[PDB]
Write an enzyme that holds these catalytic residues in place. Structure first.
Site: not given
Lengths: 191, 246, 245, 216, 240, 228, 232, 119, 227
Positions: D39-41, D56
């Protein structure tokens, strides 16, 4: 979510804060109050149901020989009844009431029982209001006012001003309003 | 023995149960014409009871007699065949439309509905367990691209595209006749083509059935881009078209 | 000739011989009249084949049933199949008011029963239903409506329909005058005259024992009710006096 | 209903052999290795007649549903990968059978039903959007199954900064290049603010898409 | 009811009728040969001439591989053979999955016979019209070969044939066969009996196919013959 | 099914010479909000039968639908007037339904009272039942009937039965002042006494009273009235 | 000829055959007669006896208080139907704590007749039963193999049924509003006419039910007294 | 009620399988929810159809589904069940029960035929 | 009541499926050539009424990105077989993440067809499918019959006058042939047995290239190749 509904003469109005209104049918409308996914799922199911009875309600032969949205079905020929939609919503909510929990307010016009405004709280808690229907957070702060100015047959412009004041007071403590009549429905947004 | 009873291939092919079902459809002799224009699709049939043991009587509301039905809201249909089988196929098409609308989240297409009904009739034909539905439909609909679409299937299950067709008795020579009318269409606002397609369909039915076709024996319906909702045209307007044609 | 031994199998020339066997069986069974009137409707059931059986209790065998105390349903075929279809109508109305709270509209009920009767006429092992059922109702605003599903599964809207023995003669008799204007109270005499004249078995004495009735009109607030014998007996006397002369 | 039992017996599905052994093992008190939380932006926005998603990484978040539908996931890597593969292949099978252009609404409905069938067990957040006959549409699916047609969406661990930047610098009828600049102004800023890798940009046009994995 | 075929039903005297007709189909197929040798198990087959445009390369429609140490060949309907060989593969791989060992061929032929007997006895569906020649190697009893049939019976065979002209092939195998036979001698015997059954003097290279299973270096290895080695074998056969 | 949300307060039912009199208060409290004050508490399954409740509105409405369909099934297969089921049958049905839900661990949050007359020797209106739209006749206590169904399916018969908060203190007043074969004025005065102490000594109670009578005439819905 | 192979095939005249053969099987059964009055319904009947060594086969079966029936056909069908109505009566008295409507029970068994004659791989019951009761009035019912139930004042099944039918029709007016002894005498005279063979204690099956008298077979002494009364 | 029914069968310990810890109580865990994952969905579908259209539609659907499912191979070799996929309208859809796989061990084929259809 | 209607007759021959082959003998031609740079499938679609939409009546369909399909039989069996073949292709795709090989899909469809021939109370199918495709193992062209037997064909014809069409194809076919020469031979073979005048809209041609996806040639391309 402050969902509001008042029955004026020859038509009903309903309102919500801010997409809580959904077009289950041209002559029927509903506003949501509860969990997001549950309220979307039940509204999708009831949309499918009410569209299906609209499709099947067409009779056999030939008879009868801001945005403004005149009914295509004249004379309420095969529009489903609002009471049937509200009661199947009651049944689905009650059968799954251990996990499914929503507070939906319903409203619309019908040829048999005229203008109508129903309410569906948590569980199978149907009740027909002939005067007004309010639920959701912050309702009590406006509730006395809802028992204040409604006389018996207060009219369209008074209803527009009154529901605007009620929704503004509830929000203080984008407005969008759908009015439903015998011949047409109009949805309009007040910033 | 029993080759012609069940849906068995029989010697030199020619599955005969399908042919018997097609003949049973033909014996009802309710001619129903469908024509596709441009941003319009007129479907026209006859308000007559199917040929069977019982007979028509004076004490009968003739308006209730009908062969044209609505699937959901935009896609109409017209089954010609047995009484129960026609409405059963109407309900099966309604069930397929409900399946598509519930699962895919948008209204069914005429092509997908026709292929689904063709698959169900295929299951009926291949399995000798159940009798074949002797009712040939005629589906119309507006696609997502805002274009008309005419379609038809049979008890064989041959779903195919069309521009002008007819179902019922005397369907062989009539294939030529509609083409001649399309020749008249070979040589405009929305209402202009709507009126032209309507009078062309009425003239096609008049030439095929070959009698006056009084206003109390026609059911006309059209789906166009102006309206897009399947609605039956009133008796007075049909009488106006009949007078204008004559 | 082989094709006629199963309802599922198609005849070579496109006509299911089993279905006309149902038609012959029902046509050789008890008759059932019904028609519409200005005040309301009236459905009549005559049991002629019971004339040999001089054992039945007084007016105990009733072929006219009701649904929701609003709809009348009657028949002419075998008793068991008709009772099964009646209980299906009751179950359909049950499920309708359970899951929608509104009384079932009549077109919904007759359509569902029509597809239910047809739902047995496309398989191989279940006996097809042998029953021609007449459903009827009357509302003040909507006047009246009388449907009739045939055993094939063919539902049509009728102002008046007769099914069974001597059905052609009864339908000829009803068409002599327009019954839309004739009231329900006065049509009983004409119905008595038709059943006494058209049917040979029905003599003067058998009119009261082996006949059934019910209306839906304004006198009973548009709801189910059988005719009281005090209403039938003057009509019987008048019909017998007229026919005797 | 005996035929459904036959269908269950013949066909496969989720086997459940080792529930009890795992119950004993977890009750006995031993720490087991953690999940890959990817889980990233991620963000997307409805630009001029074309959706412009953003994400990303070297895990390429931009996944393919159709020639006019892309998406970006945030949650458990396996759930996102399998659900995305299932949605892509379901839409491909529908396109083959029906022969029509794919629609974002069908994808939204299928994802909503699939995620609503599993209440919270499948950690699966997707920002699926694309161009269909009804124009560009962007959606904001959550792990509880609640879609919503928003003009711009930003999900992930560092979603607050991206959402704030998008709310600050969003305008209607925007140019595609300005859309890419705003996409980096969200994602790059969220990377450098939140506690990585290379940004990802892909304009979702009705036809002739383009993917830029080395965007920045 | 009146349309019942009544498959699982004895004859008036002692036999299952359909099982006989299935056997007649086995008597109306291309001949398949099976042999036992001192350094392998040979199983040739005769290719029916469907047409000259058939892809001869890698279209061995008679002999198939069930497992890394088991193969078989058919003398009946190929569509049934595909499904039955698939089920044989599934049983062999499930045995290797559960018990962690290579399947003994006796168990595999017992299980495929159980399939064919279940269709023979249970239900009303028609029986499986194909007969196999399963053969292979295992440490229990060395090299083995079997002969299943639609009736479910099976037995071992040092050398056997099935299909058209099976009597002539059996007669040829009865005379020219030895226990201490090398692989080349077994291959030449396969060519001789195939040519005798086909009635031609010179075997046609395109019209036949061959295979064997060598157990050299303590490892099973199946080799399926292609056109070049078939031509070489035929050339050596005609020159001796 | 999960728990109470929208609950009533109480209902008081007594017998007297011409029939049963039962009174609700038309309240549906949303926990601590008191949203509604015009809810239809006491239902009417058919003639000579009334089903009151005190608890969750959804369970009571589901039971109302079930009893209504039982009555419609009864009317659909009616030949004589005596074929109508008595209140004992409906009471046993509600008891069995509550017991079945208790077994399933899906309890119906209501306290039901089933009241009526278990005979038809007095009235003759059930030969011609009309669903969609003289003087009082004395009725013996034996021919009258009233019952109870608890959360756990517990049931019994008595002269006077109360539910909810009335079960604690109003039962004492009823036991003190009840007499056999009272006049309608004295009965209504006793109802007024019970409901005024309910209004004073409870928070979720109300004063907008409903009264309904079950007598030889049938079911009679007296108009709403505020307590003195 | 060709259409009687299965119970889902109608003749060219539109008529079943297996159902008619079940009716013929009922016609082959022994005789039984029942007569009602104002508040009393007697149910007598013969009892089949294969040989002199065999005692008679009992016919009457009591289903519930004020409910008892007589078989006139296949014994196994009678046993199954008796078990079903016994379970239905006991279930109704268990759940609701009241006696079951006789009309409901008759309709339920006739419904089972309908289900079992509808589907193939099934056979209609080869037995007819007198579903007689005193549910606040004397009633006698009769369910045929075809799905149908009828009600009469008096009835006879098979054997010399013509003599009993003639006697009952001749004396139908004396049966209404008569004493219990007179009703017993008339019913036993009808059974004697059915014999046309003499009534005895073993073969006779007199049974009485009505007001303040549940179903109970009469003792041997009173039965002997009644058979002495009819004899002289 | 539950837990099968004792009938003095005397064969309680088999040489093919062992009893589960829950026997047949079927305690609500993830495997139990996934077991009734398809039956519940089709129950909802039959509810929708036979409610809105009429119970005859549910009757026709169940008989068609049983008839096409009755047309299948004997137990043993897996059946394609294409006609069931057409009737239930799942041919357009690919779902978790289609892909994945369960490998399955001790029962002879004849015991499987006895267990499947009661012989 | 489950019994097999396809029962072994006396002298074997499995007669019921042979009746299905007669339908395959009574169907319009549908051929295909496996070229050195691709694989071609061609068919003769009729004009029974002259009012049919030529686009709507598809016969040369696409299953995967490099798998086509054409048939010679009744259309419903083609539709259901195509739908199940597509479902099996996506099933392989989720199982293994790659395009389904032609041999595996051919084996699966053969198993399904044989299943239906053997299954109780259902007749066999009435068409001879003609699979084609391209994969890492090169080009492929198979033919599943109603009996379920699959043959690794190189150039085959099924329909009316299939023997003469196959003989004509064999007379003018070689292993090393270009895609254009293969298309010309397909057009010549279709025009050899037509019983009329061949022109636009009477044939449909599908081609899978050495690397491009399987594309169905448009009407203009077919007209250009006709000249």
């Amino acid at each position: 979510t402050t969902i509001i509904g008042i029955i004026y003469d020859n038509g009903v109005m309903l309102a919500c804060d801010s997409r809580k209104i959904n077009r289950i049918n041209e002559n029927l409308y509903v506003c949501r109050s509860g969990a997001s996914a549950h309220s979307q799922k039940i509204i999708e199911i009831i949309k499918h149901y009410c569209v299906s009875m609209k499709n099947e309600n067409r009779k056999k032969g030939r008879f009868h020989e801001k945005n403004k949205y005149f009914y295509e079905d004249k004379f309420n020929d095969y529009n489903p009844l609002v009471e049937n939609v509200a009661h199947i919503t009651k049944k689905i909510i009650y059968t799954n009431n251990n996990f499914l929990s929503c507070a939906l307010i319903f409203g619309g016009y019908d040829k048999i029982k005229k203008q109508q405004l129903y309410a569906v709280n948590l569980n199978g808690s149907i009740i027909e209001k002939h005067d007004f229907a309010v639920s959701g957070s912050g309702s009590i702060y406006i509730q006395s006012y809802l028992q204040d100015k409604y006389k018996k047959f207060m009219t369209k412009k008074e209803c527009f001003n009154l529901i605007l004041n009620c929704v503004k007071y509830a929000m203080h403590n984008l407005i969008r309003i759908v009015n439903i009549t015998k011949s047409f429905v109009e949805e309009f947004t007040v910033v | 023995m029993y080759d012609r009873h069940l849906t068995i291939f029989s010697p030199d092919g020619n599955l005969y149960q399908i042919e018997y079902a097609i003949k049973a459809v033909k014996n009802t002799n309710i001619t129903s014409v469908g024509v596709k224009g441009e941003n319009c699709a007129v479907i026209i049939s006859q308000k007559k009871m199917a040929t069977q043991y019982i007979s028509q009587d004076k004490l009968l509301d003739y308006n209730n007699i009908t062969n044209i039905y609505n699937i959901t809201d935009e896609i109409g249909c017209s089954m010609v065949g047995m009484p129960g089988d026609c409405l059963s196929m109407v309900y099966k098409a309604r069930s397929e439309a409900s399946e598509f609308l519930y699962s895919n989240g948008y209204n069914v297409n005429a092509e997908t509905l026709c292929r689904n009904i063709c698959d169900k009739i295929q299951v009926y034909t291949q399995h000798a367990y159940m009798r074949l539905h002797a009712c040939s439909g005629m589906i119309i609909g507006i696609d997502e691209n805002n274009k008309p679409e005419l379609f038809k299937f049979d008890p064989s299950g041959f779903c195919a595209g069309y521009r002008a067709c007819v179902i019922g008795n005397k369907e062989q020579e009539s294939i030529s006749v509609l083409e001649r009318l399309l020749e008249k269409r070979k040589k405009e606002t929305i209402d202009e083509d709507i009126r032209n397609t309507t009078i062309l369909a009425i003239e096609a039915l008049q030439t095929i059935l070959a009698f006056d076709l009084k206003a109390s024996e026609i059911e006309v319906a059209i789906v166009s881009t102006k309206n897009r909702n399947f609605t039956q045209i009133s008796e007075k307007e049909i009488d106006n078209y009949l007078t204008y044609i004559a | 000739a082989g094709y006629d031994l199963s309802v599922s199998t198609f005849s070579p020339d496109g006509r299911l011989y089993q279905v006309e066997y149902i038609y012959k069986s029902i046509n050789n069974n008890n008759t059932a009249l019904c028609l519409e009137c200005k005040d309301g409707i009236i459905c009549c059931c005559i049991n002629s084949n019971m004339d040999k059986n001089k054992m039945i209790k007084k007016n105990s065998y009733n072929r006219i049933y009701h649904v929701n105390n609003n709809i009348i349903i009657t028949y002419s075929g075998f008793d068991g199949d008709a009772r099964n279809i009646i209980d299906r109508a009751r179950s359909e109305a049950n499920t309708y008011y359970y899951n929608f709270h509104t009384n079932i509209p009549l077109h919904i009920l007759v359509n569902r029963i029509s597809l239910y009767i047809h739902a047995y006429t496309l398989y191989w092992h279940m006996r097809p239903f042998a029953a021609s059922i007449i459903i009827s109702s009357f509302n003040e605003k909507d006047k009246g409506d009388i449907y009739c599903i045939e055993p094939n599964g063919a539902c049509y809207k009728y102002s008046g329909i007769v099914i069974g023995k001597n059905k052609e003669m009864f339908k000829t008799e009803i068409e002599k005058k327009d019954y839309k204007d004739i009231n329900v109270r006065d049509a009983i005499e004409d119905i008595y005259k038709f059943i006494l004249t058209s049917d040979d078995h029905m003599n003067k004495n058998n009119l009261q024992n082996l006949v059934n009735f019910s209306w839906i009109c304004k006198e009973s607030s548009y709801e189910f009710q059988n005719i009281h014998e005090e209403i039938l007996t003057p009509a019987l006397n008048k019909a017998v006096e007229y026919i005797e002369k | 209903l005996e035929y459904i039992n036959i269908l269950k017996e013949e066909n496969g599905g989720y086997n459940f052999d080792n529930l009890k052994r795992n119950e004993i093992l977890k009750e006995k008190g031993v720490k087991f290795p953690q999940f890959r939380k990817t889980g990233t932006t991620i963000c997307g926005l409805v630009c001029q007649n074309a959706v412009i998603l953003g994400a990303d990484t070297n895990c390429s978040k931009l996944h393919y549903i159709s020639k006019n539908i892309w998406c970006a996931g945030a949650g458990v890597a396996g759930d996102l990968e399998h659900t995305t593969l299932w949605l892509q292949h379901n839409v491909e099978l529908h396109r083959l059978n029906t022969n029509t252009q794919p629609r974002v609404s069908m994808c939204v409905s299928r994802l909503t039903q699939e995620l609503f069938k599993y209440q919270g067990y499948k950690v699966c957040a997707i920002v699926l959007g694309g161009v269909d006959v009804n124009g560009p549409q962007l959606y904001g699916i959550h792990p509880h199954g609640s879609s919503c047609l928003l003009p711009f969406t930003a999900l992930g661990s560092g979603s607050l900064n991206a959402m704030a930047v998008l709310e600050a610098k969003y305008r209607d009828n925007m140019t595609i290049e300005e859309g890419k600049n705003l996409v980096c102004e969200a994602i790059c800023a969220g990377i450098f603010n939140d506690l990585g890798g290379n940004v990802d940009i892909c304009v979702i046009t009705k036809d002739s898409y383009q993917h830029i994995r080395p965007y920045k | 009811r009146r349309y019942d075929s009544r498959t699982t039903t004895f004859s008036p005297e002692g036999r299952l009728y359909q099982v006989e007709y299935a056997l007649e189909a086995i008597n109306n197929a291309s001949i398949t040969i099976g042999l036992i040798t001192k350094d392998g198990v040979i199983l040739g087959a005769d290719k029916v001439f469907i047409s000259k445009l058939i892809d001869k390369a890698n279209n061995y429609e008679k002999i198939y591989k069930i497992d890394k140490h088991i193969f078989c060949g058919v003398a009946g309907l190929n569509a049934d053979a595909n499904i039955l060989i698939n089920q044989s593969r599934l049983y062999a791989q499930r045995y290797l999955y559960n018990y962690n060992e290579v399947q003994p061929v006796s168990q595999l032929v017992v299980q495929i016979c159980d399939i064919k007997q279940s269709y023979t006895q249970y239900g009303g569906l028609r029986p499986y019209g194909v007969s196999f020649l399963i053969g292979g190697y295992d440490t229990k009893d060395g090299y083995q070969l079997y002969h299943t049939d639609p009736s479910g019976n099976y037995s071992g065979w040092f050398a056997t044939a099935i299909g058209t002209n099976n009597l002539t092939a059996s007669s040829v195998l009865k005379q020219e066969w030895k226990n201490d036979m090398t692989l080349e001698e077994g291959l030449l015997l396969a060519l001789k009996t195939l040519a005798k059954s086909t009635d031609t003097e010179i075997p046609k290279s395109e019209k036949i196919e061959l295979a064997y299973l060598t157990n050299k270096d303590g490892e099973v290895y199946q080799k399926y013959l292609t056109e070049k080695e078939i031509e070489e074998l035929i050339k050596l056969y005609t020159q001796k | 099914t999960l728990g109470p949300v929208v609950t009533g307060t109480s209902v008081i039912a007594i017998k007297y010479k011409h029939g049963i009199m039962i009174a609700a208060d038309r309240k549906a409290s949303y926990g601590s909000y008191a949203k509604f004050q015009n809810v239809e508490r006491i239902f009417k399954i058919n003639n000579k039968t009334v089903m009151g409740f005190s608890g969750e509105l959804a369970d009571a409405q589901y039971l109302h639908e079930l009893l209504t369909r039982k009555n419609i099934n009864n009317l659909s297969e009616k030949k004589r007037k005596e074929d109508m089921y008595t209140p004992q049958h409906y009471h046993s049905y509600v008891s069995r339904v509550f017991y079945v839900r208790k077994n399933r661990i899906d309890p119906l949050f209501n306290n039901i009272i089933i009241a009526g007359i278990n005979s038809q020797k007095y009235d003759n209106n059930d030969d011609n039942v009309l669903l969609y739209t003289e003087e009082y006749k004395e009725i013996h206590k034996d021919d009258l009937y009233i019952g109870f169904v608890d959360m756990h399916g517990t049931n019994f018969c008595d002269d006077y039965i109360t539910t909810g908060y009335a079960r604690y203190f109003a039962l004492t007043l009823l036991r003190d002042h009840y007499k056999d074969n009272m006049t309608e004025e004295e009965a209504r005065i006793l109802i007024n006494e019970c409901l005024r102490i309910l209004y004073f000594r409870d928070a979720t109670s109300s004063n907008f009273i409903q009264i309904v009578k079950v007598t030889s005439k049938g079911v009679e819905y007296e108009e709403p009235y505020i307590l003195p | 000829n060709l259409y009687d192979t299965d119970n889902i095939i109608y003749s060219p005249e539109g008529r079943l055959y297996q159902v008619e053969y079940a009716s013929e099987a009922i016609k082959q059964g022994t005789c039984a007669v029942a007569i009602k009055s104002k508040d009393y319904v007697v149910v007598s009947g013969l009892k089949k006896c294969i040989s002199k060594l065999s005692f008679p086969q009992e016919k009457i079966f009591k289903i519930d208080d004020y409910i008892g029936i007589s078989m006139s056909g296949i014994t196994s069908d009678a046993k199954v139907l008796t078990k079903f109505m016994q379970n239905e009566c006991l279930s109704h008295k268990f759940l609701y704590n009241e006696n079951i409507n006789i009309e409901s029970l008759v309709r339920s068994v006739a419904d089972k007749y309908q289900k079992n004659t509808q589907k193939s791989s099934k056979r209609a019951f080869g037995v007819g039963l007198m579903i007689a009761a005193y549910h606040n009035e004397p009633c006698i019912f009769e369910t045929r193999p075809n799905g149908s139930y009828f009600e009469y004042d008096a009835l006879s099944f098979g054997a010399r049924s013509h003599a009993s039918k003639t006697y009952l029709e001749k004396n139908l007016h004396l049966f209404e509003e008569c004493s219990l002894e007179e009703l017993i005498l008339h019913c036993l005279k009808a059974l004697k006419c059915s014999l046309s063979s003499e009534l005895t204690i073993s073969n006779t099956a007199l049974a009485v039910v009505g007001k303040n008298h549940p179903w109970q077979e009469i003792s041997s002494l009173q039965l002997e007294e009644y058979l002495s009364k009819v004899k002289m | 009620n539950y837990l099968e029914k004792l009938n003095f069968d005397f064969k309680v310990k088999d040489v093919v399988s062992i009893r589960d810890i829950n026997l047949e109580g079927k305690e609500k865990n993830i495997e139990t929810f996934h077991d009734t994952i398809l039956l519940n969905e089709e129950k909802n579908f039959l509810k929708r159809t036979g409610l809105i259209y009429g119970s005859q539609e549910v009757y026709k659907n169940i008989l068609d589904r049983e008839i096409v499912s009755l047309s299948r191979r004997l137990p043993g070799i897996k059946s394609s069940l294409l006609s069931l996929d057409i009737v239930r309208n799942t041919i357009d859809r690919i779902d978790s029960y289609e892909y994945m796989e369960k490998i399955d061990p001790l029962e002879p084929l004849s015991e499987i035929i006895e267990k499947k259809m009661n012989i | 009541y489950s019994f097999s209607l396809t029962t072994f007759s006396p002298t074997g021959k499995l007669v019921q499926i042979e009746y299905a082959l007669n339908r395959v003998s009574s169907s319009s031609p549908a051929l295909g050539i496996r070229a050195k740079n691709g694989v071609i499938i061609a068919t003769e679609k009729k004009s029974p009424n002259e009012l049919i939409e030529e686009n709507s009546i598809f016969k040369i369909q696409q299953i995967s990105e490099h798998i086509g399909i054409v048939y010679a039989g009744m259309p419903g069996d083609f539709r259901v077989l195509l739908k199940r073949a597509r479902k099996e292709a996506i099933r392989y795709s989720l199982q293994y993440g790659s395009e389904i090989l032609v041999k595996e899909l051919v084996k699966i469809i053969a198993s399904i067809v044989q299943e239906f021939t053997q299954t109780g109370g259902v007749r066999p199918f009435g068409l001879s499918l003609l699979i084609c495709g391209v994969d890492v193992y090169g080009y492929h062209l198979y033919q599943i019959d109603p009996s379920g037997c699959y043959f690794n064909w190189m150039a085959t014809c099924v329909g009316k006058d299939y023997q003469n069409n196959m003989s004509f194809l064999e007379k003018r076919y070689n292993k090393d042939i270009e895609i254009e020469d293969a298309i010309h031979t397909a057009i010549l073979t279709l025009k050899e047995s037509y019983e009329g005048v061949l022109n636009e809209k009477n044939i449909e041609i599908g081609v899978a290239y050495d690397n491009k996806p399987f594309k169905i040639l448009t009407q203009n391309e077919i007209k250009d190749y006709l000249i």
